[PDB]
Design an enzyme around this catalytic site. Sequence first.
Site, short mmCIF file in Angstrom:
data_model
loop_
_atom_site.label_atom_id
_atom_site.label_comp_id
_atom_site.label_asym_id
_atom_site.label_seq_id
_atom_site.Cartn_x
_atom_site.Cartn_y
_atom_site.Cartn_z
N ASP A 107 39.13 -100.68 8.25
CA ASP A 107 37.73 -100.97 8.03
C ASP A 107 37.45 -101.64 6.70
O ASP A 107 36.49 -101.29 6.00
CB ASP A 107 36.81 -99.75 8.35
CG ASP A 107 35.42 -100.19 8.82
OD1 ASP A 107 35.23 -101.40 9.07
OD2 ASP A 107 34.53 -99.33 8.93
N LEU A 163 22.45 -91.73 -1.89
CA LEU A 163 23.15 -92.97 -2.17
C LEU A 163 23.08 -93.93 -0.98
O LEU A 163 23.09 -95.15 -1.17
CB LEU A 163 24.60 -92.68 -2.58
CG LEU A 163 24.85 -91.55 -3.60
CD1 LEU A 163 26.34 -91.32 -3.80
CD2 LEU A 163 24.20 -91.85 -4.94
N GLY A 164 23.00 -93.37 0.22
CA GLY A 164 22.94 -94.11 1.47
C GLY A 164 23.13 -93.24 2.69
O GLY A 164 23.50 -92.07 2.57
N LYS A 165 22.89 -93.83 3.87
CA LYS A 165 22.98 -93.17 5.18
C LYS A 165 24.05 -93.87 6.06
O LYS A 165 25.21 -93.96 5.65
CB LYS A 165 21.59 -93.12 5.85
CG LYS A 165 21.36 -91.88 6.70
CD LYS A 165 20.00 -91.89 7.38
CE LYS A 165 19.84 -90.73 8.35
NZ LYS A 165 18.47 -90.66 8.92
N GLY A 166 23.64 -94.37 7.23
CA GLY A 166 24.52 -95.05 8.18
C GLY A 166 25.28 -94.07 9.05
O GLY A 166 26.00 -93.21 8.53
N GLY A 167 25.11 -94.21 10.37
CA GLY A 167 25.72 -93.38 11.41
C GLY A 167 27.12 -92.87 11.11
O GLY A 167 28.06 -93.67 11.06
N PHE A 168 27.29 -91.55 10.86
CA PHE A 168 26.25 -90.53 10.91
C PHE A 168 26.37 -89.51 9.75
O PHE A 168 26.42 -88.29 9.98
CB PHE A 168 26.20 -89.84 12.30
CG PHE A 168 27.53 -89.65 13.00
CD1 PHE A 168 28.56 -88.92 12.41
CD2 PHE A 168 27.74 -90.16 14.28
CE1 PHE A 168 29.79 -88.76 13.04
CE2 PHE A 168 28.97 -89.98 14.92
CZ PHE A 168 29.98 -89.28 14.30
N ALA A 169 26.40 -90.02 8.52
CA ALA A 169 26.50 -89.19 7.32
C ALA A 169 25.47 -89.59 6.27
O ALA A 169 25.14 -90.77 6.12
CB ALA A 169 27.90 -89.27 6.75
C1 LIG Z 1 30.02 -91.19 -0.68
C2 LIG Z 1 30.17 -92.21 0.48
C3 LIG Z 1 30.75 -93.56 -0.02
C4 LIG Z 1 32.14 -93.33 -0.62
N1 LIG Z 1 33.27 -93.08 -0.06
N2 LIG Z 1 34.19 -92.93 -0.95
C5 LIG Z 1 33.68 -93.06 -2.15
N3 LIG Z 1 32.37 -93.28 -1.99
C6 LIG Z 1 31.33 -93.57 -2.90
C7 LIG Z 1 31.50 -93.45 -4.25
N4 LIG Z 1 30.48 -93.76 -5.07
C8 LIG Z 1 29.34 -94.24 -4.58
N5 LIG Z 1 28.38 -94.58 -5.50
C9 LIG Z 1 27.08 -94.98 -5.24
C10 LIG Z 1 26.72 -95.69 -4.08
C11 LIG Z 1 25.40 -96.09 -3.90
C12 LIG Z 1 24.46 -95.85 -4.91
C13 LIG Z 1 23.06 -96.32 -4.80
O1 LIG Z 1 22.37 -96.30 -5.82
N6 LIG Z 1 22.46 -96.36 -3.60
C14 LIG Z 1 21.03 -96.74 -3.52
C15 LIG Z 1 20.47 -97.02 -2.12
C16 LIG Z 1 20.04 -95.76 -2.88
C17 LIG Z 1 24.86 -95.21 -6.10
C18 LIG Z 1 26.15 -94.80 -6.27
O2 LIG Z 1 26.54 -94.15 -7.42
C19 LIG Z 1 25.58 -93.94 -8.46
N7 LIG Z 1 29.13 -94.38 -3.27
C20 LIG Z 1 30.07 -94.03 -2.38
N8 LIG Z 1 29.86 -94.20 -1.02
C21 LIG Z 1 28.57 -94.83 -0.57
C22 LIG Z 1 28.61 -95.34 0.90
C23 LIG Z 1 27.11 -95.45 1.27
C24 LIG Z 1 26.41 -94.30 0.49
C25 LIG Z 1 27.38 -93.84 -0.62
#
Ligand SMILES: CC[C@@H]1[C@@H]2NN=CN2c2cnc(Nc3ccc(C(=O)NC4CC4)cc3OC)nc2N1C1CCCC1
EC number: 2.7.11.21
Length: 281
Positions: free
Chosen positions: A134, A17-23
């Site tokens: 944040d 879903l994504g990266k970014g320092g540091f997870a």
């Molecule tokens: C799991 C980490 C956090 C978070 N924290 N609390 C709830 N969180 C999240 C919940 N759902 C999501 N959903 C998604 C985020 C990005 C994507 C996406 O498609 N990302 C594309 C770049 C590859 C898809 C998601 O769900 C299908 N991200 C979360 N995020 C995103 C932050 C950056 C990566 C995931």
Amino acid sequence: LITDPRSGRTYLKGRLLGKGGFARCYEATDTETGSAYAVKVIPQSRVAKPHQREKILNEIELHRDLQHRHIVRFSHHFEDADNIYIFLELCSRKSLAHIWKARHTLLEPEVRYYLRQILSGLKYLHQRGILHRDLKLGNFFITENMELKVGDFGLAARLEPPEQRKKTICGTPNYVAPEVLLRQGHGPEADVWSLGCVMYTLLCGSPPFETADLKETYRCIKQVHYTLPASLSLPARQLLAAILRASPRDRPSIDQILRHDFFTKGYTPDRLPISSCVTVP
Ligand SMILES: CC[C@@H]1[C@@H]2NN=CN2c2cnc(Nc3ccc(C(=O)NC4CC4)cc3OC)nc2N1C1CCCC1
């Protein structure tokens, strides 16, 4: 690949879903139930030092019991010698940062629609004596129902009196309150300021104190030097002006923000279409 705890319960790692320092974050589905989560995979080596260990434990500690429709539901965590796996509410429509990258600007009813949800989320946090610290688009998670969930408690803190609170400079620079840059720490007023920045970014396209340099941004924040585009409605400019105040005590509370004309006299759609994630609704 697969992730598993102490019970041997397996989870299939989906797309990154994504990266970014540091997870590293993944969609993770339980192999036996199919239950989907957004999993934060934190390497143990990146959090081996005390300060980094304390940051990760605090996030888990503060996020654990948070139960509000406008707050990301913490599911569970577990850890092995390699990683810390944090299971969180998966929000299928990514984040407001993703929508902002696709849209650049949102229409006034959309901004109002999301601001209400953010404010509902923040109020819950504030009532529980937790400061987010944040608040940014990147931290506002969108579900399939176009419901905003305030997420990422990586910088969340116990709300402390001014003299007691840590005076550390932290939080996203474009969203950070002047008292934080002035080493006075974060109060609930600093979260309110970050929301003023959120509002501005969503309406105008960029954070209000964005410049080429971090030093210049910090100077613009401290002097509350930003331009209000003529095209924004009078209630939007009035609310931005009331929120973006150098002095934290001069800023409106969440209850006061919600009683402002921007919200009281404006149209808020009951729901936004899924299409609004990528194009104008
Ligand atoms: C799991 C980490 C956090 C978070 N924290 N609390 C709830 N969180 C999240 C919940 N759902 C999501 N959903 C998604 C985020 C990005 C994507 C996406 O498609 N990302 C594309 C770049 C590859 C898809 C998601 O769900 C299908 N991200 C979360 N995020 C995103 C932050 C950056 C990566 C995931």
